[PDB]
Amino acid sequence: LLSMDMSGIQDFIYNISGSKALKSLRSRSFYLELMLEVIVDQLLERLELARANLLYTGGGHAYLLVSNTDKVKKKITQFNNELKKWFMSEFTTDLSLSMAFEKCSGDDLMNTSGNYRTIWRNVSSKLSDIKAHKYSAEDILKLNHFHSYGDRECKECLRSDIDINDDGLCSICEGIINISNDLRDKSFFVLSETGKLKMPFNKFISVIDYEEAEMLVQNNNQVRIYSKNKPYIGIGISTNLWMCDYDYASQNQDMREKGIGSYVDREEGVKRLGVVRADIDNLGATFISGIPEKYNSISRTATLSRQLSLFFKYELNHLLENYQITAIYSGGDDLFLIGAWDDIIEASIYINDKFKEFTLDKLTLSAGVGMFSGKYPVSKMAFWDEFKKNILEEKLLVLQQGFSQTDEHGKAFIYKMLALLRNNEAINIARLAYLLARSKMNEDFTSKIFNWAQNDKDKNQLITALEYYI
């Protein structure tokens, strides 16, 4: 049982500060995903083995069930060595990969005495402690002695070791820009020896359409077409790669990808941006513990993993269709959406409910949403029932109806409301009583608002809702 872990995704994906940031992020998550996919496929080619042997992929992980042969082990070790060489050559700290495997027998897989979970934890532990020792002696000496003439940090990509070129961009990030430009229009990605973007095994990735992909097939070229969630392709080495690539900015009159301002410039509220991050809280046990004592088979673990992958890689794309939001990092257990402040919140709640349906209220979501001004480095942009029923549905609707029916009460009146509410003093409460007496709303609105302000939980909900209003 062989397991692979990608070292530095959360750092390398979040060194983005440029104006084209959104284009790169879609290109960067896809770049890491395609790295993992091509490396796993290349491994399976080394093993002369089938694609069915890949149990799970996603995030920076991968799980394989390969033959327990000395030949297999020597090939794994050799390919690990070449792999580590290559990553040291290209990024040297930002991205690294780890290999680990631990023996298992048929009796183990058939779920005899829960030893499936024991071996799962053992392989996890060996993977997680081999990361401690990543560099041999000679490698670490080799790194420290290069008085090599090089240029300075890539603007889009924070890296000293990298060397910039035209317009202060290095090769890697310029290729990232190009493939990002091609992402929205073209659906197929090819593994070719000339290509655009540098890739592990002396290979390059470029973009294709079904027709020239077809010609490549009849060109009997050693190609692997990687698709954008397209079934019924039947083109050469069909690879329906699972990925959620959604962007509302392409729904406008211009098909070309636009910058972060396309979402900032919304006039329905403050010109800001919304960001959401989500992780399944009960996932470690779910893959490890699973269904206890009766269904912890390798078959059912595979089924569970695939169903989670399909949810986090298809359903989100269809759910997002009604929101001004763009999908950035999706897959594994991580969900990253960026867009308008209101749309981000509404989509977060809606996707939370939909997920509770898909897992039948067995798995939950932990999420956090913040507000930041436009064109802030997206790198630093990134570093339930009560909120829906009480705040968004009841108090927010009451306040919206009241403010829509009575005019002249803008952000100044609500901000005086805020000054009285945040400073939790009885003098502010009496002042608020007078202010609601002076306000020209229906008496029901005033009474409800005052009585909400009189309760700490209800005053906090009220301030949250009215802050959402502005």
Partner 1 sequence: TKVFKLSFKTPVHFGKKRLSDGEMTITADTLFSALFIETLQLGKDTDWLLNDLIISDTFPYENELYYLPKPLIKIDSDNHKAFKKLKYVPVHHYNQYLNGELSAEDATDLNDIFNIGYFSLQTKVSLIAQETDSSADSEPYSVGTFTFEPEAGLYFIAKGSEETLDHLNNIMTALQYSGLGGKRNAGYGQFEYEIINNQQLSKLLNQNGKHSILLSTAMAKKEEIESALKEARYILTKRSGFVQSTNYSEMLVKKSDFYSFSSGSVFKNIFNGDIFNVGHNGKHPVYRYAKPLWLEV
Partner 2 sequence: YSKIKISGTIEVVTGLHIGGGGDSPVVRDLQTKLPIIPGSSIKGKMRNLLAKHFGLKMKQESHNQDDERVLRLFGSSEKGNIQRARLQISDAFFSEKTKEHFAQNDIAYTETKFENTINRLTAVANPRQIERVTRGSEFDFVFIYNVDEESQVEDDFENIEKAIHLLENDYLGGGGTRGNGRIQFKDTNIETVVGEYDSTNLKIK
Partner 3 sequence: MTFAHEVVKSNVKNQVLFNGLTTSKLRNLMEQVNRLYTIAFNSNEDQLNEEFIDELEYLKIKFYYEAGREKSVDEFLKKTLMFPIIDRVIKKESKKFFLDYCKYFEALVAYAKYYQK
In the sheet that 54-58 helps form, which strands lie side by side, from edge to edge? 54-58, 61-64, 2-6, 97-101
Q: Shortest distance, CB of residue 56 to partner 2, whole angstroms?
A: 42
Specify the residue, 285 or 430, whose C-beta has the smaller distance to partner 2: 430
Q: Looking at 69-77, 140-148, 209-217, 323-331, which segment touches partner 1 (CB under 8 A)?
A: 140-148
Please list every residue from 394 through 423 that binds partner 2, using CB under 8 A.
Answer: 410-412, 415
Q: Looking at 68-76, 226-234, 280-288, 429-437, which segment touches ligand ATP (CB under 6 A)?
A: 280-288
Ligand-binding annotation for 305, yes or no, is: yes
Ligand-binding annotation for 409, yes or no, is: no
Q: Shortest distance, CB of residue 84 to partner 2, whole angstroms?
A: 41
Q: Give the x/- contact pattern for partner 2 in 50-89, rule: CB under 8 A.
A: ----------------------------------------
End-to-end alpha carbon distance in the chain: 54
CA separation for the pair 204, 192 (Å, rounded): 5
CB atoms under 10 Å from CB of 337, counted, come to 26
DSSP state of 239: -
Q: Give the x/- contact pattern for partner 1 in 356-395, rule: CB under 8 A.
A: --------------------xx--x---------------
Binds partner 1 by CB under 8 A, chosen from 158, 270, 345, 363? 158
Q: Shortest distance, CB of residue 136 to partner 1, whole angstroms?
A: 8
DSSP state of 199: E
Q: Is the dihedral of CA 165, 169, 173, 174 positive or negative?
A: negative
CB atoms under 10 Å from CB of 317, counted, come to 16
Structure tokens at 82: 């070449």
Q: Is 234 left (phi over 0), alpha (psi -120 to 50) or beta?
A: left
Please, are residues 432 and 421 in contact by the beta-carbon 8 Å criterion?
yes
Ligand-binding annotation for 248, yes or no, is: no
Binds partner 1 by CB under 8 A, chosen from 125, 282, 401, 405? 125
Please, are residues 97 and 39 in contact by the beta-carbon 8 Å criterion?
yes
Q: Shortest distance, CB of residue 430 to partner 3, whole angstroms?
A: 6
CA separation for the pair 349, 337 (Å, rounded): 13
Closest CA to 193 of 183, 206, 182: 206
Q: Shortest distance, CB of residue 334 to partner 2, whole angstroms?
A: 28
List the beta strands (DSSP E) in 121-184: none
CA separation for the pair 335, 325 (Å, rounded): 12
Structure tokens at 25: 């992020």
Please list every residue from 383 through 442 that binds partner 3, using CB under 8 A.
Answer: 430, 433-434, 437
Specify the residue, 135 or 469, whose C-beta has the smaller distance to partner 1: 135
Q: Shortest distance, CB of residue 32 to ligand ATP, whole angstroms?
A: 3
Q: Looking at 2-10, 69-77, 114-122, 405-413, which segment touches ligand ATP (CB under 6 A)?
A: 2-10
Binding-site residues from annotation for ATP: 9-10, 29, 56, 61, 131, 284, 305, 329
Binding site for partner 3 (CB under 8 A): 430, 433-434, 437, 443
